[PDB]
From Swiss-Prot:
Keywords: Electron transport, Flavoprotein, FMN, Transport
Protein name: Flavodoxin
One Pfam family per UniProt: Flavodoxin_1
Protein species of origin: Nitratidesulfovibrio vulgaris (strain ATCC 29579 / DSM 644 / CCUG 34227 / NCIMB 8303 / VKM B-1760 / Hildenborough)
Family annotation (InterPro entries): Flav_short, Flavdoxin-like, Flavodoxin, Flavodoxin/NO_synth, Flavodoxin_CS, Flavoprotein-like_sf
Cited function: Low-potential electron donor to a number of redox enzymes.
Domain Flavodoxin-like residue range list: 3-144
Names of the cofactor(s): FMN
Family as reported in the entry's similarity comment: Belongs to the flavodoxin family.
NCBIfam families per record: flav_short
MF annotations from Gene Ontology: electron transfer activity; FMN binding
Length: 147
C-alpha cells in the first residue's frame, strides 16, 4: 500500500516519531511518503494514499496550541480529501500539562467530523520518544494490521 506521513515538530520529537514509523512501514513493503507539514499544501493532499498518518506536538500550556507548522493544514483539513480515507494520528506531549497531547485529540475529532476512518487510537507519547521506541514500533505494526 501507499502511505503518506505528515508531521509538525518544533524540537524534533514528533519528527523522530514519524521517521521511526516510516521505517517500520517501508520495511514491510509499503511505499511511504514522509513530509514535514511546513512544506505541504492542503488541497487534495490525501488523494492517492491508502493510509494517511498525521503527527503533531501539543503547545500552549493553558490553552491548546497546535505545533506551529501544522496549524495551516489543520485549518484547511476540509480540502485534503479526508472523506472515507483511512487515517491514524500520533504526537508528542508531556503529561505534566493539563491537555496532554491535546493536539492529537483535536485532529482526531476534526477527521471524524470530516468522515475519515480512524483505523487505530492515536499514539500519545510522553517525554523523549527515543525512550518509548518499542511503543512506536508496536503502534506502527498495529496500524498495518488495521488497514
Ligand atoms: C512552553 C511549552 C508548552 C507546552 N505545552 C504542552 C501542552 O499544552 N500539552 C502537552 O501535552 N505538551 C506540552 N508541551 C510539551 C511538548 O509537546 C513536548 O516537548 C513535545 O515533545 C514537543 O514535541 P516536538 O519536538 O515534535 O514539537 C509544552 C512544552 C513547552 C515547552
Amino acid at each position: 500500500p501507499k502511505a503518506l506521513i505528515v508531521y509538525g515538530s518544533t524540537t524534533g520529537n514528533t519528527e523522530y516519531t514519524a521517521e521511526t514509523i516510516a521505517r517500520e512501514l517501508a520495511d514491510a513493503g509499503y511505499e511511504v511518503d514522509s513530509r514535514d507539514a511546513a512544506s505541504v499544501e492542503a488541497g487534495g493532499l490525501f488523494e492517492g494514499f491508502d493510509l494517511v498518518l498525521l503527527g503533531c506536538s501539543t503547545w500552549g500550556d493553558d490553552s491548546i496550541e497546535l505545533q506551529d507548522d501544522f496549524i495551516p493544514l489543520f485549518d484547511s483539513l476540509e480540502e485534503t480529501g479526508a472523506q472515507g480515507r483511512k487515517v491514524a494520528c500520533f504526537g508528542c506531549g508531556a503529561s505534566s500539562y493539563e491537555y496532554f497531547c491535546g493536539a492529537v485529540d483535536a485532529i482526531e475529532e476534526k477527521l471524524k467530523n470530516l468522515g475519515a476512518e480512524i483505523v487505530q487510537d492515536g499514539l500519545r507519547i510522553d517525554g523523549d520518544p527515543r525512550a518509548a521506541r518499542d511503543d512506536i514500533v508496536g503502534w506502527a505494526h498495529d496500524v498495518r494490521g488495521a488497514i
